[PDB]
A paper describes a structure:
The trimeric spike (S) protein is the major glycoprotein on the [name]-[name]-2 envelope and is responsible for engaging the [name] receptor for viral entry, and thus, it is a prime target for vaccine design and therapeutic antibody development. Receptor-binding domain ([name]) in the S protein plays an essential role in [name] receptor recognition, and mutations in the [name] affecting receptor binding and viral infection have been reported. To unravel the underlying molecular mechanism of the S proteins of Omicron BA.2, BA.2.12.1, BA.2.75, and BA.4/5 bound to hACE2, we determined their atomic structures of the S (BA.2, BA.2.12.1 or BA.4/5) or [name] (BA.2.75) in complex with hACE2 by cryo-EM or X-ray crystallography. According to our previous reports, the binding interface between [name] and [name] could be divided into two patches (patch 1 and patch 2).
Previous studies showed that the [name]-[name]-2 PT could not infect mice, whereas omicron BA.1 can achieve close-contact transmission in mice and result in severe lung lesions and inflammatory responses, suggesting Omicron has the potential for transmission from mouse to human. Compared with hACE2, H34 is replaced by Q34 in ghACE2, mACE2 and RatACE2. K31 is a very conserved residue among hACE2, ghACE2 and RatACE2, but it was substituted by N31 in mACE2 and formed two H-bonds with BA. When R493 of BA.2 was substituted by Q493, these H-bonds were gone, resulting in a decrease in their binding affinity. Notably, BA.2-R493Q mutant has a significantly decreased binding affinity towards mACE2 or golden hamster, and slightly impairs the binding capacities of BA.2 to ratACE2. In our results, three-[name]-up conformation was observed to bind the hACE2 or mACE2 receptor.
Author numbering:
A (entry chain A): 19 to 614
B (entry chain B): 333 to 527
The structure:
């Protein structure tokens, strides 16, 4: 009861100053992303330097508070959040060396180029370069040369850098009273609670391994089906029982299998729901799209959007002497300022992205009453989950017909449901094994289990165990394959995408059950149902003031992550796949290899 | 007929900060409160024990007008019995109140692109304020035990802080102008009456 009052006063002062010092930085960043000019870059840099210096000084000052003396949980949470700023609690020279390594990694990834084995006139890059040539083409050699060349350049030029990066990051992590840098990443999910509710940061490895065990039976069947359909486009290249070659997955790395849709359509005679023509005929613009999104959100009890949102936000390409960034983003600036930056157009994809971004802003507005240090998401992947559950119940035929973009006498087709489910499956299910494998590999390398001299020897060995892909040509230890990903050479964690997928389906089942709907889950819609809105706003207004095991309990009525709802979502596709795979063989043998 | 000077109270080029709140004594004039409804939609107009639309039927010895500028969310702290920052360290109303408050938006006049730093408020004080009491002191607050000899630093902070208004803020953070009218009837005839 002696330092608790001091902590309260210190937190009050910090909250008063931080909002003012952060609004300027956010506003400068916004002014640069909507203008792009030499002066604006300097303004952004000088705005960010002040905030960084102030935050570092405040964290160093706040380090002098013994946590055991405090009783009140909220102040302890705020102080624990403020103290954890050991991203540069090292020596100066080591910090400069690490910054130089990171900068050279980023530059060498961005500026890398690949030249054709034949005439060197082409010498393409990644950009709209290699990405298109191996996202559209259906020729073996055309994909193979690019896939081999990109690795034989980037990995060769990146291996020593990553070798030094591992040890520097481990030193950084151990200086912060951790075990390794992988534990530093895993510490995001750690939470402390009163009545149980504790989530030790060592259990995640057990949890991620458990849930994946229940997704293997479904994925396996999908991995069979696609394989069959790949035996027609490339006849004499894929064994009936084995692993798919890496360079034939419709993407540079195999993160997504969406681009395999044209060759894997089960019913080509029935086209998907395309609504752009109706929008053009009816005379729609961007403003109408966003008013429709706002109406859908207010139909479930959530509040409207402020007049500042309409006044300030950029919603169309300015078509003036101004260059902008057209990556869609949702901005919260503090002091009640919310905006969207989107170069939106008249298409279904923009229509769904509007709902996604508007859900981001709804969550931000919901947690706007908490103190400043707790105005974040409840976890690393709650934001996206909340964003995607809104767009999930917006492309359903019921909602589209309910607003007039589809004929009123429309008849649902049983053959179309399978196509929609298959596209969703190739988008969603096909990415979980890749993320799990990559994160396990980085965790093992950081922990020191994998020797420095066997990295690739493990990377591929367990690649043809979980995801089920075989390399086209052998790679020596001089290679560094995983450095080619943007989420590896430039830091960033990679486990948020595994948690987001499961969270979104749990939330969707909870809300659609709370809205009293009977039938298939993928057809459920939450519009014009006030009951689901209050249940969602119950979690959305907490921020991270309470452990993430409590908001999940509030909404879905559980205390961990379960994959049963995901299995309910894809049940008809599971039955159809099982029916059509009853003659062929499921599973793969880890012995076949395209080389000798 | 000599009307009361309300026109010069609700109209002013520049108002006063919340901690240094102004107070005007109105006495010996005929008061027509019906001209108080000559502004934009009032955000707050609620009267405690005076029965509005009957202001023209009472007589009081003198009236006090107190004017200041505060944030949007703080307007609820200008009621009797409330607790917060403004109601504890800047401006507090007694439990037995007789009169009422008028609060309206002033975003078009008190907001600038770079920030308006001419409005200040108190954040730290040793003990709460008695009703109708003004503090203007600028002594550095001492929260810890070690004195810092009047220089800012750890465990001693500057009590006054600025609002910093901008036109792009949300409604709850835009500036609001508040005028409080306090009536009192005493054993000294009565000079403030109706038409
Ligand atoms: C964009 O930059 C120009 C030149 O610096 C500036 O005059 C303008 O105010 C900026 N903002 C706009 C055009 O919204
Ligand atoms: C359902 O919600 C939509 C929101 O766009 C609204 O237009 C409609 O009137 C509501 N009711 C029905 C029966 O569609
Ligand atoms: C205040 O000034 C405006 C403009 O000069 C005027 O219209 C109004 O009558 C004045 N008085 C009040 C009470 O608004
Ligand atoms: Zn998003």
């Amino acid at each position: 009861s002696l330092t608790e009052e001091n902590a309260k006063t210190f937190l009050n002062n910090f909250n008063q100053e931080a909002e003012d010092l952060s609004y300027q930085s956010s506003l400068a960043s916004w002014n640069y992303n909507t203008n792009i000019t030499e002066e604006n870059a300097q303004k952004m840099s000088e705005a960010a330097a002040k905030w960084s210096a102030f935050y570092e000084e405040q964290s160093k000052t706040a380090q002098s508070f013994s946590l055991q003396e405090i009783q009140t949980p909220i102040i302890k949470r705020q102080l624990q959040a403020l103290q954890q700023s050991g991203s540069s609690a090292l020596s100066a020279d080591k910090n400069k060396q690490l910054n130089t390594i990171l900068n050279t990694m980023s530059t060498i990834y961005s500026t890398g180029k690949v030249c054709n084995p034949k005439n060197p006139q082409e010498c393409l890059l990644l950009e709209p370069g290699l990405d298109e040539i191996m996202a559209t083409s259906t020729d073996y050699n055309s994909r193979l040369w690019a896939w081999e060349g990109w690795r034989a350049e980037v990995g060769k030029q990146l291996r020593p850098l990553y070798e030094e990066y591992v040890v520097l990051k481990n030193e950084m992590a151990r200086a912060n009273n951790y075990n390794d840098y992988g534990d530093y990443w895993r510490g995001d999910y750690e939470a402390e609670g009163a009545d149980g509710y504790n989530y030790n940061r060592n259990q995640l490895i057990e949890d991620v391994e458990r849930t994946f065990a229940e997704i293997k039976p479904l994925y396996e069947h999908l991995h069979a089906y696609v394989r069959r359909k790949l035996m027609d486009t490339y006849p004499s290249y894929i064994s009936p029982t084995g692993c798919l070659p890496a360079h034939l997955l419709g993407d540079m790395w195999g993160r997504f299998w969406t681009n395999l849709y044209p060759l894997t359509v089960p019913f080509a005679q029935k086209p998907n729901i395309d609504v752009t023509d109706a929008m053009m005929n009816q005379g729609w613009d961007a403003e109408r799209i966003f008013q429709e999104a706002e109406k859908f959100f207010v139909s479930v009890g959530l509040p409207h959007m402020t007049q500042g949102f309409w006044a300030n936000s950029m919603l169309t390409e300015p078509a003036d002497g101004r260059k902008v960034v057209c990556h869609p983003t949702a901005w919260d600036l503090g002091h009640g300022d919310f905006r969207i930056k989107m170069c939106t157009k008249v298409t279904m994809d923009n229509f769904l992205t509007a709902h996604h971004e508007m859900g981001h802003i709804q969550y931000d507005m919901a947690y706007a009453r908490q103190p400043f240090l707790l105005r974040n998401g409840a976890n690393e992947g709650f934001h996206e989950a909340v964003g995607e559950i809104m767009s999930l119940s917006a492309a359903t035929p019921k909602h589209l017909k309910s607003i007039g973009l589809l004929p009123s006498d429309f008849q649902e087709d049983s053959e179309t449901e399978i196509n929609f489910l298959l596209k969703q499956a190739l988008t969603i299910v096909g990415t979980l094994p890749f993320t799990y494998m990559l994160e396990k590999w980085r965790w093992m390398v950081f922990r020191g289990e994998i020797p420095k001299e066997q990295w690739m020897k493990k990377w591929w060995e367990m690649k043809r165990e979980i995801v089920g892909v075989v390399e086209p040509l052998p790679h020596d230890e001089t290679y560094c394959d995983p450095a080619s990903l943007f989420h590896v050479s430039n830091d960033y964690s990679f486990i948020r995408y595994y948690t987001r997928t499961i969270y979104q389906f749990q939330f969707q089942e909870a809300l659609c059950q709370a809205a009293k709907y009977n039938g298939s889950l993928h057809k459920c819609d939450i519009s014009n149902s006030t009951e689901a809105g209050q249940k969602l706003l119950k979690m959305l207004s907490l921020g991270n003031s309470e452990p993430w095991t409590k908001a999940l309990e509030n909404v879905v009525g559980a205390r961990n992550m379960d994959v049963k709802p995901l299995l309910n979502y894809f049940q008809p596709l599971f039955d159809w796949l099982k029916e059509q795979n009853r003659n062929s063989f499921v599973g793969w043998n880890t012995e076949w290899s395209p080389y000798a | 007929t000599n009307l009361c000077p309300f026109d010069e109270v609700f109209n002013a080029t520049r108002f006063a900060s919340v901690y240094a709140w102004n107070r005007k004594r109105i006495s010996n004039c005929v008061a027509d409160y019906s001209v108080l409804y000559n502004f934009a939609p009032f955000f707050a107009f609620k009267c405690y024990g005076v029965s509005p639309t009957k202001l023209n039927d009472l007589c009081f010895t003198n009236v006090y007008a107190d004017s200041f500028v505060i944030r949007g969310n703080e307007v609820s702290q200008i009621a009797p019995g409330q607790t917060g920052n403004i109601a504890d360290y800047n401006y507090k109303l007694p439990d037995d109140f007789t009169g009422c408050v008028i609060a309206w938006n002033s975003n078009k006049l008190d907001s600038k692109v770079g920030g308006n730093y001419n409005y200040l408020y108190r954040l730290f004080r040793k003990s709460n304020l008695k009703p109708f009491e003004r503090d203007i002191s600028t002594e550095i607050y001492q929260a810890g035990n070690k004195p810092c000899n009047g220089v800012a630093g750890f465990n001693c902070y500057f009590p006054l802080r600025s609002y910093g208004f901008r036109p792009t803020y949300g409604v709850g953070h835009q500036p609001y102008r508040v005028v409080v009218l306090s009536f009192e009837l005493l054993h000294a005839p009565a000079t403030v009456c109706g038409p």
